[PDB]
Every structure is written in C-alpha cells, then in structure tokens.
Design an enzyme around this catalytic site. Structure first.
Site: not given
Ligand SMILES: Cc1cc2nc3c(=O)[nH]c(=O)nc-3n(C[C@H](O)[C@H](O)[C@H](O)COP(=O)(O)OP(=O)(O)OC[C@H]3O[C@@H](n4cnc5c(N)ncnc54)[C@H](O)[C@@H]3O)c2cc1C
Ligand SMILES: O=C1Oc2ccccc2C(=O)[C@@H]1C[C@H]1C(=O)Oc2ccccc2C1=O
Ligand SMILES: Cc1cc2nc3c(=O)[nH]c(=O)nc-3n(C[C@H](O)[C@H](O)[C@H](O)COP(=O)(O)OP(=O)(O)OC[C@H]3O[C@@H](n4cnc5c(N)ncnc54)[C@H](O)[C@@H]3O)c2cc1C
Ligand SMILES: O=C1Oc2ccccc2C(=O)[C@@H]1C[C@H]1C(=O)Oc2ccccc2C1=O
Lengths: 222, 222
Positions: B148, B154, B160
């Site tokens: 995300g 990072y 982070h």
């Molecule tokens: C419990 C939890 C902990 C997390 N911790 C962190 C963290 O520590 N650090 C961090 O940075 N993030 C974190 N996240 C965020 C997470 O990493 C992101 O939500 C995730 O990487 C997004 O991947 P996704 O596959 O779910 O994307 P999605 O949201 O499922 O997809 C994004 C987009 O891709 C599109 N798409 C799908 N298929 C195709 C295709 N074939 N072609 C083109 N487009 C397509 C979809 O339509 C959508 O618009 C966390 C999330 C959760 C739930």
């Molecule tokens: O999407 C983001 O938006 C931000 C805006 C301002 C400052 C920091 C962040 C983040 O850390 C990332 C990802 C964000 C993250 O790094 O940690 C997580 C832990 C658990 C679940 C989801 C997440 C995230 O999506």
C-alpha cells in the site's frame, strides 16, 4: 489497579511457553494487576483474514478489498464477534504481553493472523495517526520470546545476524506502528540446552521483572 | 524444460495479486516451463502447526514437541497428506515464486503457516546443513510483493525504514536458510495509487523479467 492482557501462541500446555504465561499471570495478580488472556490455541483462534470478518452486506462484494471493507465494518460495528471480543481486551488493557516461541525468525502464524484480523484500521492505526501518534500510545507492549538458538547465533558475528534487526518488523512495524510504548524484549535463548533448575530461575527472573515492569523505560524509536 | 512453483497468498481472484500470478504462470508456460501452483486460499490451506500434522502414534504424546515429532514423521513417512503434497511440489520445483501483498511488514499468516508446516527439518533444513549448504541449494526463489505504501516510505529516510531490512527475516531467515539462491524481490509499490494503464505495464514488465529469470544473478549473503 492496572489491567494486563497476555497473548500466548503455543499449542502445548506442557510447554515452557505456557509455563512463562502462568508465571507472568501469577506475578501480576500478586501485584494487584487484573489479568485477561488470549490463549490463541485454546481459543482455536481463526488467523485467516477473509470477508467473513465482516457480518451482513458488503459495500463492494464483487471486488472485495479487505482494508476498505474491514475499516468500514469497525466504524459501523459490523466486525465478526471473535475479532470484536479481542479488540475489547486491548481497549481495556494497559499492558500487553506477547508470549511465543520464535518461529522462522518471527511470530507463529496464529499470532501473525491475530495481528492481521484484530488490528483493523481506525482501531489500531490510521494513515494519519501512527507511531508516536498511534491509538495505543497510552499502552505498553512487550515480547517474551523463547528460541532454539543461542544469543550469540543471534548477533552480528553469529550465523543468523543481530536479533534487534530480526525483531524490528514486529517491535517497530507492528507494536510501535500502532502507538505502543514498546518495552525491552524478554529473550530466553537455547531452550533445549537449559536444565531444570535453570528453567526455574528463568521463570523466577521473569516474574521478578514484572514486579516493576510498568516503571521501565520504553525503547527509543527515531 | 524447467519446473516452477507459484505460491499465492491472496483471498481474492479479483485482486491484482491474482493477476500477477496469472501473468507469471502465462509467461513461464510460453517459455516452456512447467507450472504448478499453491493458491493457499483456494486450497483452504491449514496454516496452524499441531500434532495433527503427524498421523498415527507419537513418540511422546504426553509432552508433545513439534520439532522432534515432525522431523521424525518426515523421515519415517508419517506427515499429514496436505503437507506431503506441498513438499512434493517443492522437490520437483527448480524455481519457486511467492506472490503476496505485504501485510504488517511481512508475509500473510497463511503463507507464514505454510512455511511452518511445510518446511520441516531434514526436508527443508538441518542444524548441520543450512544457508549455502541447505537442501534447496539447487533451487531459486523470488518474492513478488505488492504494498500500500510507497518505495520512499520504505527507505532510510522514510517513516518505515529500509525495505531490505524489513525483508531480511524472509529472504535470509527463511529462503536462504533453507539453501535457496534468492533472486531480487519484485516490488510493486503504491497499489492503490496506480491507474489502470500503469497496472497493465506492471504485469507486462513482470512477465518480461520472467523471460530470463533463471539467468539472473542471485543475492549475495555474507
Ligand atoms: C492485514 C493487512 C496488512 C497490511 N500491511 C501493510 C504494510 O505493512 N505495508 C504496506 O505498505 N501495505 C500494507 N497493506 C496494504 C496491502 O499491501 C495492499 O492492500 C495490497 O498490496 C494491494 O494488493 P491487492 O492485490 O489487494 O490489490 P487490489 O486492491 O485487489 O487491486 C488493486 C487494483 O488492481 C486491479 N486489477 C485486478 N486485476 C487486474 C488485471 N488483470 N489487470 C489490471 N488491473 C487489475 C483491481 O481492479 C484494483 O483496481 C496491508 C493490508 C492488509 C489487509
Ligand atoms: O497506504 C499507505 O498510506 C500512508 C499514508 C501516510 C503515511 C503512511 C502510509 C502507509 O504506511 C501506507 C501503507 C499502510 C502501511 O504501511 O501499514 C499498514 C498496516 C496494516 C494495514 C495496512 C497498512 C497500509 O496500507
Ligand atoms: C516451526 C518452527 C520454527 C522455528 N524457528 C526457529 C528460529 O527461527 N530460530 C530459533 O532459534 N528457533 C526456532 N524454533 C525453535 C523454537 O523456538 C523452540 O522449540 C521453542 O522456543 C521452545 O519453546 P517450548 O515452549 O516449545 O519449549 P518446550 O520444548 O515445550 O519445553 C522445554 C522444557 O521446558 C520444560 N518445562 C515446561 N514447563 C515447565 C515448568 N513449569 N517449569 C520448568 N520447566 C518446564 C519442559 O518440560 C521441557 O523440558 C522453531 C520451532 C518451530 C516448531
Ligand atoms: O537449535 C539450533 O541449533 C543449531 C545448531 C547449529 C547451527 C544453528 C542452529 C540453530 O539455528 C538453532 C535453532 C534453529 C533455528 O535457528 O532455525 C529454525 C528454523 C525452523 C525450525 C527450527 C529452527 C531451530 O531450532
């Protein structure tokens, strides 16, 4: 009259980890603390995030996105009961202890899943309020970890590298991220090499530290 | 005629992660690879280590210890079918790809549990044969991670910290520990900020890299 939560991640009641939880709970009660537990294995806790974490109708069921859906469910009150029960334990807790054996250089899957399902947005963190500004900034957390390997294996010269670098994604990435004042890890090394009388002193030393755990100086995070 | 295993850790078929697995599988088949998959969610994979990982009678059922019991079960052939099936995929694989969203600065619980249940002693590592001497030293592994957060978040200056320090317990502590030649992580940042046409190029760039993935230079581990 402070409140403590002990999260345990071990399958066996006969384990040294279980013994350490018992020791922790006893020392804190003796000091007037109120003690609540989350024995993840005894609870048969479900550690897999899914759309079943949200009750009732979803916003976008065709394209389910856990972050958006779960946050909304927390705000509106539509999270599954098991998650809610855990979030309530945390809300009431001043001190949270995590008792677990080190597994592949981190927390066991069931504890990792606990973080993933329980630490929902708005509740445990917001994009706008994390680290020092985190929701849990009035609380303290501590890891109590048992290892198969030695303290020296987990050093700069050891084959595994420094333990503090290994624990960073947990202590900083999870605990401090959510606002916790993280206390120094209780590290119990070389479990399999430790004789009975030494294990007893380990339990006694842990209970001893807990007598004044709240007065301790937290870790520093830049 | 090489063999590849793709381990996917995402609940949604509509996810970008699933799309990345599909892209990987298609590019490798087009290049002559044989492709086997472990869609942990579609498999409803059990990620919780327990004594039910061993079939039949145990050595010491009164004081169950997972490491000793599980190793013995691997050697004698008494592991549960689901674990055995996974170990067979690895044994046949030249290249293993791990496709997952970063969750709390690491692998999702279901993938962590996969490591814990599948990477049994003697099979995946021994106390005497690890890292360069690991059982998987003829194989290559690569993480493909979606986040995300941004690449700059990072980094050393970001909130982070450096991603390479975050991924160390996985790349070194798990993959290299078991002998894998670890290849450079495919990092897809800021998923939620990425427009449709850019996501398509992301998929195309990933398939492009996979055209010559085997010839790549592995990471260096001191
Ligand atoms: C419990 C939890 C902990 C997390 N911790 C962190 C963290 O520590 N650090 C961090 O940075 N993030 C974190 N996240 C965020 C997470 O990493 C992101 O939500 C995730 O990487 C997004 O991947 P996704 O596959 O779910 O994307 P999605 O949201 O499922 O997809 C994004 C987009 O891709 C599109 N798409 C799908 N298929 C195709 C295709 N074939 N072609 C083109 N487009 C397509 C979809 O339509 C959508 O618009 C966390 C999330 C959760 C739930
Ligand atoms: O999407 C983001 O938006 C931000 C805006 C301002 C400052 C920091 C962040 C983040 O850390 C990332 C990802 C964000 C993250 O790094 O940690 C997580 C832990 C658990 C679940 C989801 C997440 C995230 O999506
Ligand atoms: C999947 C997996 C991954 C792992 N990864 C790692 C890793 O990356 N790095 C690493 O270093 N290690 C690793 N280990 C090893 C693991 O950390 C140790 O096995 C664990 O820490 C030992 O804890 P335990 O509670 O199981 O001890 P046990 O073996 O259950 O107990 C040890 C001794 O304590 C005794 N005991 C129990 N109760 C009491 C009591 N009340 N008073 C006194 N004595 C008592 C028991 O009788 C026993 O003799 C891993 C293990 C597994 C299964
Ligand atoms: O007990 C040990 O014996 C050793 C002897 C010589 C060299 C190194 C080691 C170790 O790494 C540790 C712990 C060892 C480890 O650090 O990694 C693991 C990963 C999965 C499962 C179990 C473990 C361990 O018990």
């Amino acid at each position: 009259g402070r409140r403590a939560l002990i999260v345990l991640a071990h399958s066996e009641r006969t384990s040294f980890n279980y013994a350490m939880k018992e020791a922790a709970a006893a020392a804190l009660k003796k000091k007037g603390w109120e003690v609540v537990e989350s024995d993840l294995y005894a609870m048969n806790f479900n550690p897999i995030i899914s759309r079943k974490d949200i009750t009732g109708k979803l916003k976008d069921p065709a394209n389910f996105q856990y972050p958006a859906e779960s946050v909304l469910a927390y705000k509106e009150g539509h999270l599954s009961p098991d998650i809610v029960a855990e979030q309530k334990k945390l809300e009431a807790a001043d001190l949270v202890i995590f008792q677990f054996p080190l597994q592949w250089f981190g927390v066991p899957a069931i504890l990792k899943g606990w973080f993933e399902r329980v630490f929902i947005g708005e509740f445990a963190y917001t994009y706008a309020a994390m680290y020092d500004k985190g929701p849990f900034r009035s609380k303290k957390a501590v890891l109590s970890i048992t290892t198969g390997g030695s303290g020296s294996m987990y050093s700069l010269q050891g084959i595994h590298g420094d333990m503090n670098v290994i624990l960073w994604p947990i202590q900083s990435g999870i605990l401090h991220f959510c606002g916790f004042q993280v206390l120094e890890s209780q590290l119990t090394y070389s479990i399999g090499h430790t004789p009975a009388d030494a294990r007893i002193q380990i339990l006694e030393g842990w209970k001893k530290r807990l007598e004044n755990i709240w007065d301790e100086t937290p870790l520093y995070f830049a």
